[PDB]
Amino acid sequence: HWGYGKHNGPEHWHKDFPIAKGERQSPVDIDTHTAKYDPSLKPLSVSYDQATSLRILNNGHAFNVEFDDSQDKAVLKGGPLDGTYRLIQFHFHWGSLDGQGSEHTVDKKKYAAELHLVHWNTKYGDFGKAVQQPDGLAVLGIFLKVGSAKPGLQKVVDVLDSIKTKGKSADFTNFDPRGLLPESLDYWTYPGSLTTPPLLECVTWIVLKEPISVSSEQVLKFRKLNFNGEGEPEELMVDNWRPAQPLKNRQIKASFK
Ligand SMILES: [Zn+2]
C-alpha cells in the first residue's frame, strides 16, 4: 500500500522495501559542477523506428505506456551501455504545480515532470530476470518544462480521460516514442535504482540534459488523473515523484564537455 501521501509516501517506503536506504538509490541531484566529462562515453543509440505500443494503463501511481517487447524492435544501446536493451514501457512523474514534479534535479532545480523510458538488457531474457541484475535495466530520463506544447505528446494526453482511475487500461497502439525526445542526446549517467517499489538497484540511468517543453494544458490533463479506484474518494494523481536520494559512493559522468 505504498503511494505518495502523508502516510504512505517515499519517507515510509523503507519499511516494506529496506533497500530504500541502500547504496545505489535513485533519483539523485545532478551537480553539473562536479559531474565530470567522460571521453570514454559513447553517443546514445536510440532505435525506435519499429517500436510497437500496445496499451496504456493507470496503475494507481502513474500511467504506463506499453510496448510489445517480444521482438527486437525498440532498443537502446551505446551510451554507457554494453549490449542491447529493449523498450518495455514509459511513464512520467509530475507535480501539483509547475515548480516541482521531476525526480532527478539539476543543481537542485526541479522540473515540472520527468519521463522515464524503461528498457531491459536482452542478455537476461525478460524484464523480471533483468531487475535482479545490477546491469539489468537502462532508463532514459527526460525532463519536462512547461511552455510550448509537445505535439508528439498529444496522443497520450487525449487518452487519459479513459484511464482516469486505478486499474483502468485502454488499447494504445501505434504511439511513436520518438515524438517525446528532445533535439540533443547529450546525457549524464550513473548507476542507480528503480524510483518506485521494489526500488531494486538494477538501473543504468541515462538522463538527458535537454528538457522537452509541454504546454500548461497538457500538464493540466495529467493532473486530472486519479490515484484512487473508481468508486473511491477522489485523490488527484499529482506529486508522484520520489525526492533525490544520497549519492553515496557514486560518480555522475557527463557525455559532453
Ligand atoms: Zn519513473
Curated annotation (Swiss-Prot):
Effect ascribed to mutating residue 91 to Y: In OPTB3; partial loss of activity
Xref: SMART domains: Carb_anhydrase (SM01057)
Gene Ontology CC entries for this record: apical part of cell; cytoplasm; cytosol; extracellular exosome; myelin sheath; plasma membrane
Involved in the binding of some activators, including histamine and L-histidine, annotated site positions: 89
Effect of residue 195 to D/E: Strongly reduced activity, but enhanced zinc affinity
Active site residues according to the UniProt entry: 61
Annotated phenotype, changing residue 139 to H: Impaired activity
A GO biological process held by the record: morphogenesis of an epithelium
Outcome of mutating residue 2 to A: Impaired activity, not rescued by 4-methylimidazole (4-MI)
Compartment(s): Cytoplasm; Cell membrane
Effect of residue 198 to A: Normal CO(2) hydrase activity, but impaired stability
Phenotype for residue 15 to E: In Jogjakarta
Activity regulation behaviour: Activated by X-ray, histamine, L-adrenaline, L- and D-phenylalanine, L- and D-histidine, L-His-OMe and beta-Ala-His (carnosine).
Effect the entry attributes to changing residue 196 to H: Higher affinity for bicarbonate. Enhanced proton transfer capacity
Family assignment from sequence similarity: Belongs to the alpha-carbonic anhydrase family.
Disorder this protein is connected to according to its UniProt record: Osteopetrosis, autosomal recessive 3: A rare genetic disease characterized by abnormally dense bone, due to defective resorption of immature bone. Osteopetrosis occurs in two forms: a severe autosomal recessive form occurring in utero, infancy, or childhood, and a benign autosomal dominant form occurring in adolescence or adulthood. Recessive osteopetrosis commonly manifests in early infancy with macrocephaly, feeding difficulties, evolving blindness and deafness, bone marrow failure, severe anemia, and hepatosplenomegaly.
Role: Catalyzes the reversible hydration of carbon dioxide. Can also hydrate cyanamide to urea. Stimulates the chloride-bicarbonate exchange activity of SLC26A6. Essential for bone resorption and osteoclast differentiation. Involved in the regulation of fluid secretion into the anterior chamber of the eye. Contributes to intracellular pH regulation in the duodenal upper villous epithelium during proton-coupled peptide absorption.
Protein name (database record): Carbonic anhydrase 2
Gene that specifies this protein: CA2
